[PDB]
JSON list of C-alpha atoms and ligand atoms in Angstrom, two decimals:
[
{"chain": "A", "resi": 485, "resn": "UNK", "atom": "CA", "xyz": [-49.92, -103.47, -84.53]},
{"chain": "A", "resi": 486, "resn": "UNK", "atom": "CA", "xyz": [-50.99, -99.86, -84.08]},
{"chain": "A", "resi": 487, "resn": "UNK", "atom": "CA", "xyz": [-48.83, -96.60, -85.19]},
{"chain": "A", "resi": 488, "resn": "UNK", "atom": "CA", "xyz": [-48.10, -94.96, -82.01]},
{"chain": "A", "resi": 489, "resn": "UNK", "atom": "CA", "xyz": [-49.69, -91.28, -82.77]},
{"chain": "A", "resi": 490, "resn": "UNK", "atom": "CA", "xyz": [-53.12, -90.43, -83.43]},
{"chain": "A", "resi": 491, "resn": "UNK", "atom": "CA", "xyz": [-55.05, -87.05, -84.10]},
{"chain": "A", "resi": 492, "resn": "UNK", "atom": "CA", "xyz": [-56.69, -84.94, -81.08]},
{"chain": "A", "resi": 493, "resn": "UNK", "atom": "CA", "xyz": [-60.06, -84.02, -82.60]},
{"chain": "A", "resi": 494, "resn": "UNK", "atom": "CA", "xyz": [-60.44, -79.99, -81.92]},
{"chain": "A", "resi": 495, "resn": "UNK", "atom": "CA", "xyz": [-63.62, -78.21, -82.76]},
{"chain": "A", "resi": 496, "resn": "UNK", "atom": "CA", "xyz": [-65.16, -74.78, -81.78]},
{"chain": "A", "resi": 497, "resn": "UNK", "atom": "CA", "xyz": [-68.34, -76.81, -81.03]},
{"chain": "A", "resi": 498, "resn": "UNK", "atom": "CA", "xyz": [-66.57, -78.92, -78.33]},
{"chain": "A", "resi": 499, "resn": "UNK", "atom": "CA", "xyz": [-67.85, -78.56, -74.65]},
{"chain": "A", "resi": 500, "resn": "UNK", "atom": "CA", "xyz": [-65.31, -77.50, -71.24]},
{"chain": "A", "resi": 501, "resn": "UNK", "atom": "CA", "xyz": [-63.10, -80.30, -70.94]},
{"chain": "A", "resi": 502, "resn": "UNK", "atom": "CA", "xyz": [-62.46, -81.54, -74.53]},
{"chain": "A", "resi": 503, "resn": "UNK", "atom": "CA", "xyz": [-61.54, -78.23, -75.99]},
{"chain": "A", "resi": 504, "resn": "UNK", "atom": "CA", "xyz": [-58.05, -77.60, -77.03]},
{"chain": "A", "resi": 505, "resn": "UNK", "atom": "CA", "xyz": [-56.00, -76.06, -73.92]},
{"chain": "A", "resi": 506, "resn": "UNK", "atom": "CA", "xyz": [-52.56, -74.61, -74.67]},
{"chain": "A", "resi": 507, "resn": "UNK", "atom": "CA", "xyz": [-50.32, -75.26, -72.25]},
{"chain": "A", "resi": 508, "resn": "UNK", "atom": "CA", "xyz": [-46.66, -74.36, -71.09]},
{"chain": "A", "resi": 509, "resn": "UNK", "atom": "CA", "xyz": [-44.34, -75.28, -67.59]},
{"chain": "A", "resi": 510, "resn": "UNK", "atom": "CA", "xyz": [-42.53, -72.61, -66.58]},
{"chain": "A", "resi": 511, "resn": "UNK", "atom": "CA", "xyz": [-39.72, -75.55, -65.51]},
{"chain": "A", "resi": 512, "resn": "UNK", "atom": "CA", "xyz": [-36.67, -74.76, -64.10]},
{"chain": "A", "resi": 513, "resn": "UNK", "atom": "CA", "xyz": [-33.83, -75.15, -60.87]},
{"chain": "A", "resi": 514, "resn": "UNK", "atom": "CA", "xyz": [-32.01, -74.01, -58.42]},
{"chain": "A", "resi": 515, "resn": "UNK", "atom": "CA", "xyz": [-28.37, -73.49, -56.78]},
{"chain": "A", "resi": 516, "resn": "UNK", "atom": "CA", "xyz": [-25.77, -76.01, -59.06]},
{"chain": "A", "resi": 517, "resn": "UNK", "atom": "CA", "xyz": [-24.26, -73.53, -61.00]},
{"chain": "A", "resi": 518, "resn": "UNK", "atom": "CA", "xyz": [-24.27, -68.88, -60.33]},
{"chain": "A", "resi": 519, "resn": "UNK", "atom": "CA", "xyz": [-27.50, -67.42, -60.54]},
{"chain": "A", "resi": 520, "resn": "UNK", "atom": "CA", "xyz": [-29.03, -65.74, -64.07]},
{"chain": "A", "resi": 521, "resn": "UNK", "atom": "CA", "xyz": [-32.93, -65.34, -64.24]},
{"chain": "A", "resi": 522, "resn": "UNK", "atom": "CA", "xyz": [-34.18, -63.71, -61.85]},
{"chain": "A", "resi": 523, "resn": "UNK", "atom": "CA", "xyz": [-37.50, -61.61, -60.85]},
{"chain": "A", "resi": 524, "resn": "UNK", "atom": "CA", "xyz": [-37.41, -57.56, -61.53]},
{"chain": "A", "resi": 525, "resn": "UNK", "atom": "CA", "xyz": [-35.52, -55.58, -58.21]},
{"chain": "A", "resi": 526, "resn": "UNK", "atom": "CA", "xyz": [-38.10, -52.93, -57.62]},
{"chain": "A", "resi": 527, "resn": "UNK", "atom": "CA", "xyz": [-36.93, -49.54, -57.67]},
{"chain": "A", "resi": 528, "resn": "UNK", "atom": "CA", "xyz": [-37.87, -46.53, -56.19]},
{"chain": "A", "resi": 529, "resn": "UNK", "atom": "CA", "xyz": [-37.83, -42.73, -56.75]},
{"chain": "A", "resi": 530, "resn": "UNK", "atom": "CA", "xyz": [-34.49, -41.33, -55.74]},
{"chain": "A", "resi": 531, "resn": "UNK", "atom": "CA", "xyz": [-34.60, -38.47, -52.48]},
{"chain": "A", "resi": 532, "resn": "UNK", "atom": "CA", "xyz": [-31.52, -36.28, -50.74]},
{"chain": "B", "resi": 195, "resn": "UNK", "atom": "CA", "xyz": [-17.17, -69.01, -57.71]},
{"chain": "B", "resi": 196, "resn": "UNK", "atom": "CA", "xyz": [-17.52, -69.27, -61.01]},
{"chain": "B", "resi": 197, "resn": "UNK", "atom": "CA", "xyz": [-18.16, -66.19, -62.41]},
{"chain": "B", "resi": 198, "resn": "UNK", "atom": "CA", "xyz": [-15.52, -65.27, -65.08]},
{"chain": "B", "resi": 199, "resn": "UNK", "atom": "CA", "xyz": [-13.52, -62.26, -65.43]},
{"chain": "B", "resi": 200, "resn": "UNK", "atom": "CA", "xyz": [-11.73, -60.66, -68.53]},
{"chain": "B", "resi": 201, "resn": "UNK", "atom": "CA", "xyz": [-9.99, -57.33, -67.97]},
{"chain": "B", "resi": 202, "resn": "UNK", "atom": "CA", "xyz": [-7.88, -55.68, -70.62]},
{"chain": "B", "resi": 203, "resn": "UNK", "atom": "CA", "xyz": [-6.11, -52.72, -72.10]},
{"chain": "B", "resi": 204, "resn": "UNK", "atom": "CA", "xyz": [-5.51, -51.15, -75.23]},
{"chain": "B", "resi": 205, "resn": "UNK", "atom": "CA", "xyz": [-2.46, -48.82, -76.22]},
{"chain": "B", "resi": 206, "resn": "UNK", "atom": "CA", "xyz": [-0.53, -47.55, -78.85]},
{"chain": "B", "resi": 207, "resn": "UNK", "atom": "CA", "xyz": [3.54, -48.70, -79.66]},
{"chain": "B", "resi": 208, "resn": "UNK", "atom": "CA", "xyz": [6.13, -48.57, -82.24]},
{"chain": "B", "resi": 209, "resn": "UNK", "atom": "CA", "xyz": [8.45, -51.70, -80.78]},
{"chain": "B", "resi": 210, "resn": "UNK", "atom": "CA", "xyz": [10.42, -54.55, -82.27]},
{"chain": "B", "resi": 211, "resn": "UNK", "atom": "CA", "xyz": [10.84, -57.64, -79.97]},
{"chain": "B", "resi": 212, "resn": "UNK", "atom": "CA", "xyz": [9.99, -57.03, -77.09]},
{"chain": "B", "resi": 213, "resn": "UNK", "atom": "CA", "xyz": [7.38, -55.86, -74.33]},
{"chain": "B", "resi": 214, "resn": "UNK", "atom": "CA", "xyz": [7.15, -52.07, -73.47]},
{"chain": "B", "resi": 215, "resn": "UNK", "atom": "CA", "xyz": [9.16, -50.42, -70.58]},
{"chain": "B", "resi": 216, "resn": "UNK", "atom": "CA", "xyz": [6.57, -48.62, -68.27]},
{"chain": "B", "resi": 217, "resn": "UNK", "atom": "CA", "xyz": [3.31, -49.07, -66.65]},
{"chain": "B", "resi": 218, "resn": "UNK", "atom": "CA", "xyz": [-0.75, -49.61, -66.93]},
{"chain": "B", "resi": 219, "resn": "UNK", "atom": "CA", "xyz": [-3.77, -50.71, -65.19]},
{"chain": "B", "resi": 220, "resn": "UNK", "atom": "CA", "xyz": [-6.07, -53.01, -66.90]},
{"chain": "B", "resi": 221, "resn": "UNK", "atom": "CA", "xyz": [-9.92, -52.01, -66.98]},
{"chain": "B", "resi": 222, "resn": "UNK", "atom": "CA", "xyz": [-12.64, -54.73, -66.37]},
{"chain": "B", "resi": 223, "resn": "UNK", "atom": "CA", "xyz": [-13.93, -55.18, -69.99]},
{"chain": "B", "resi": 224, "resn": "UNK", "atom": "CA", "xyz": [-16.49, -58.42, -69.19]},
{"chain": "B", "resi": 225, "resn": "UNK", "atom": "CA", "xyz": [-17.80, -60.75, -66.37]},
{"chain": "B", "resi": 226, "resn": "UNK", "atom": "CA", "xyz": [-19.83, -63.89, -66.73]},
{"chain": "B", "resi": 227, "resn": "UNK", "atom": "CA", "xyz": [-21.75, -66.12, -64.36]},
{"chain": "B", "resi": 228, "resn": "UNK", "atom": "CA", "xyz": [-20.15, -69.22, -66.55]},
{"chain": "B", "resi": 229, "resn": "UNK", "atom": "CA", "xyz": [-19.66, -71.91, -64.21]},
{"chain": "B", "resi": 230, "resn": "UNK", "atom": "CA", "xyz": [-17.50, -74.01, -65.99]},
{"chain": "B", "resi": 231, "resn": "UNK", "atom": "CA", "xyz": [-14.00, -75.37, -64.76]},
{"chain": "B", "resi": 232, "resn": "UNK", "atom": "CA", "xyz": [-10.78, -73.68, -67.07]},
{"chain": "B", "resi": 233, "resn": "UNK", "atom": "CA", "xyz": [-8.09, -75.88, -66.75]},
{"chain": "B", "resi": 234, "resn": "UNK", "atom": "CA", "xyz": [-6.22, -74.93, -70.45]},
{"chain": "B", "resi": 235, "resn": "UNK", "atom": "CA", "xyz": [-6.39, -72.62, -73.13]},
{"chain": "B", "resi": 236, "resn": "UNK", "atom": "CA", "xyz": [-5.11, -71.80, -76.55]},
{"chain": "B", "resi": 237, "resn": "UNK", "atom": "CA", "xyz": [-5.38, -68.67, -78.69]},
{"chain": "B", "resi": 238, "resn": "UNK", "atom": "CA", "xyz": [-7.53, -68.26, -81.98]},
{"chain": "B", "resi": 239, "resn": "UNK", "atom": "CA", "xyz": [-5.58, -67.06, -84.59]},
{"chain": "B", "resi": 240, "resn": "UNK", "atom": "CA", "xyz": [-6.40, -65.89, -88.50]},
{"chain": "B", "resi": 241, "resn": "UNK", "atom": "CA", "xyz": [-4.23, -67.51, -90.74]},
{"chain": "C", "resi": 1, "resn": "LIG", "atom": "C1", "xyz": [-19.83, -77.93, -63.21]},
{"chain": "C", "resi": 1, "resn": "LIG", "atom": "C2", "xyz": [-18.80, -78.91, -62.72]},
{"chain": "C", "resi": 1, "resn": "LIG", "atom": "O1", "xyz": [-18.78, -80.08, -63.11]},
{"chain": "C", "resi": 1, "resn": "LIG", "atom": "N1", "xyz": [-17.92, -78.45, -61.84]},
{"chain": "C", "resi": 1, "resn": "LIG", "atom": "C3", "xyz": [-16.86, -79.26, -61.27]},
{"chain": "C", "resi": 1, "resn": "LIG", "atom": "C4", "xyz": [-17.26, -79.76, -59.88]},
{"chain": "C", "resi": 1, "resn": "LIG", "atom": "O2", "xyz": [-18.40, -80.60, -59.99]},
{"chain": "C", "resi": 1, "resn": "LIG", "atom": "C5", "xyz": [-16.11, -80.52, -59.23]},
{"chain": "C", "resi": 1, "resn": "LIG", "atom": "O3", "xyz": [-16.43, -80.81, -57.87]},
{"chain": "C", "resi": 1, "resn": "LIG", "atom": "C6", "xyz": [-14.83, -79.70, -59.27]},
{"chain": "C", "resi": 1, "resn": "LIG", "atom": "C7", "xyz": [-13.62, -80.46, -58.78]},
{"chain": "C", "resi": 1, "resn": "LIG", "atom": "O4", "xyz": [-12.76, -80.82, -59.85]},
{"chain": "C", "resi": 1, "resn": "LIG", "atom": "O5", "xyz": [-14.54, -79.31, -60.62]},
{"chain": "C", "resi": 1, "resn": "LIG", "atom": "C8", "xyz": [-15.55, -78.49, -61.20]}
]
């Protein structure tokens, strides 16, 4: 029997590798339903 | 496509029973990139 979780040990002492690394996915997809997020449309200074 | 329009109009009347006599031109109020299929609607009503 063992309970499924356990503890990550996280000290300031701790070498590269075992330190604590905070994560994210930017996760996402593509074409199933009309678009939404998007990257910013550069815009430029307006001339006549 | 799937993108969902509402346009509407708002006006003032003093009638009874039945829809006004005359014209207008409905202004796009609100469009959405929804998606979803529409197939029946009800209104939402206050008691
Ligand atoms: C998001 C979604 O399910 N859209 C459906 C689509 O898959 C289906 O091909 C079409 C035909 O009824 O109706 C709508």
């Amino acid at each position: 029997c063992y309970f499924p979780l356990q503890s990550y040990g996280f000290q300031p002492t701790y070498g590269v590798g075992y330190q604590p690394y905070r994560v994210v996915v930017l996760s996402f997809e593509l074409l199933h339903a009309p678009a939404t997020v998007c990257g910013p449309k550069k815009s430029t200074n307006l001339v006549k | 496509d799937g993108y969902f329009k509402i346009y509407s109009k708002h006006t003032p009347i003093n009638l009874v029973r039945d829809l006004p006599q005359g014209f207008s031109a409905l202004e796009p109020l609100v469009d959405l990139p929804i998606g979803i299929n529409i197939t029946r609607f009800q209104t939402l009503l206050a008691l």
